[PDB]
Amino acid sequence: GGAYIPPAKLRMMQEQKNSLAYQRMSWEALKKSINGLINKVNISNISIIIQELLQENIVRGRGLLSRSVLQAQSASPIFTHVYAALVAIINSKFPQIGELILKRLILNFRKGYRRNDKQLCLTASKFVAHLINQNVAHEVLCLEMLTLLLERPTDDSVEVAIGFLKECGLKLTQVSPRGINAIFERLRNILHESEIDKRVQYMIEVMFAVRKDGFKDHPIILEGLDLVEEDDQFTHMLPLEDDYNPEDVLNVFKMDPNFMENEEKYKAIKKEIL
Template sequence: MEESIEYQKKSWIALKKSINGFLNKINKANIKHIVPELFSENLIRGRGLFCRSIMKSQLCSPVFTDVFAALVAIINTKFPQIGELLCKRMILQLQKANNNKTHTLATVKFIAHLVNQQVLHELIALELVTLLLDKPTADSVDVAVCFVKECGSMLQDLCPLGLHGIFERFRGILHEGKIDKRVQFLIEDLFALRKHKFPPAVTPELDLVDQEDQLTHEISLGDKVDPQIELDIFNPDPNFVENENKYEELQKRILGGSDDQEEEEEDDSEAEDEEEEESDCLGNRATPTQLRIEDETETNLINLRRTIYLTIMSSVDFEEAGHKLMKMKLEPGEEMELCIMLLECCSQERTYLKYYGLLGQRLCMINKLHQKNFEESFVQQYSMIHRLETNKLRNVAKFFAHLLGTDALPWHVLAYLRLTEEDTTSSSRIFIKILFQELSEQLGIRMLNERLTDPDMQESFESIFPKDNPKNTRFAINFFTSIGLGGITENLREYLKNMPRLILKQDKRVSRSGESDGESDDHQRKRRRRS
């Protein structure tokens, strides 16, 4: 039942995970694509989770502060209560961060960009700088300088007199000469920056909200703030289904612009179809090739990938995700997109999550077609492994190691890996290293050695354990020994040890065959002379 507490709790966990996922991958390039996906989640129910997650993300990555502020500005136009809650929590965080300069710098930077986006009123900026410079210390002046650098352009436009008063206070601090030289240099740099004009408050790619649409919150540093911490904790909702339905209707209204455009395009296409039918009735019949319409915009493919992504990221566990993905109606040829999106989601995580391996295993066990697609994906990923970052490379290697360790993927795919000095790069060697180390942890070195010495699979493993020449053999032995898996090279060591004897035997066989051929040639020559 959707109204059950257990279902609501799972939905709450999925909402939290989804919001965190969106905030972890947002940047200037994809913010326009992330916003519609974020609005598809119930932000009213998860407003506490959103504020908590974005504040935590900004503290960890202050370099993305302008992106986070732009996102808040967009959401504030539709849900002002979320913007107000975030502003209140930022004020509270600033009050608690007095003894931590790093947190203070990150917090005032976020406040400055919220002022730039006009989510917060500019008066709080003047109030904050005045408070910092009231009893100046080296740290407080340093924080004030950083703050003015971030929002000086906006203050210059909105309240130039207030900004002039702030710089007069900075000038007085310089004349007093009570602070150290480093801070004095910071103030002088700030004056130089003002002289040459501050950089734009908002970059063009993040100027996404019209000024008349923005709602500005007036909050003072001295106000009593209610952070509403209870919103961060799961609480059962007796009207859960009703509230979810209300948000779905609200979401359709918010995202209705794109839907209206799609409807207009559909109407235009229907009108064109009617005109073609009328021309057919007049005798101008078109050929089947003329009536065929191809979607070169890949709109359907993009929608499919979005659906798969949201299903994977919003599911509580791999069983729920597998069930939802198997219920999807995929057209012939679209099954590969499922595998590609699963690998893409896995590679984007900061650390490998077993959730993706279990989901891939479930798909392979249910349908052999998915197993074949993952085999093709293995080949594709290895062929372009040099393009992946180290973190993505590690996640992909661990994903395929899980599939191999659980026999969800056939081991003959290892035939695509050729372990020689000439055929590998630094990236491919890291991939093979992580793959086999993960297999060793899953199966154990004894079980892994048994699998690799299976007589029926030796043809598939010849490229991993090359025996074509001593140089490649030694390279493979040294490689596995260096990564702590020398135990799986015992047969290769034995082969290398006996290699001189094998070469001598081959040489003797060649010489014997040569002598026999020579004797037969001499005998034929003698018979010709006699004749």
């Protein structure tokens, strides 16, 4: 508890010659800056947001950036795609952040699936789909998720699976046609040989209609976000079933004795990353 005070009224109180207290201040400042930038990101400003994010030591704060991106995507799924694009850029320069984001996203999806958390399933699945579209994650992840949802299908499972396929179906078709054809064959078999509600059969029908339309309402990446060339991207292969450590300890501040030295090292790398 306690009343919030504006930061201006805080700068008049104390001032800091740098090491321990500086590290704590800079850690909190980095967290605030990353959170603000993730709140600012959109398609029209993706480039400037990328360069301003790269000006920050995002490898030291890779857990902070991961947590902020996941929170933003979970709370604002309308922008999943651009978030993915953002990742797709940073992952092209610092793959460890992409791997970290991907692993905690997979654990989030699995937790939601186990916990019967609808909205979290939808958000995590959409994020996985658009990270697949940006070549950040290997397409295997999609196919295993769809097989999981359709092995013993329920109404809700078919709904979440069909919503997931809507987003990544074009990429799956270009990359793995036989897998998506198997998915559609299973969809037809469930549409016919199963007792089901009219709504879910209608959803299967609209999925077949969108495939017949060629996913014209669900492109891979919208114009303005294809910013990493296939040959320059680093596509992580993380299966769904593997046991992962989200490394939550990376979100908590710890003092490093060579702090200023590694900070200068990151500044030297930043004067290289353009």
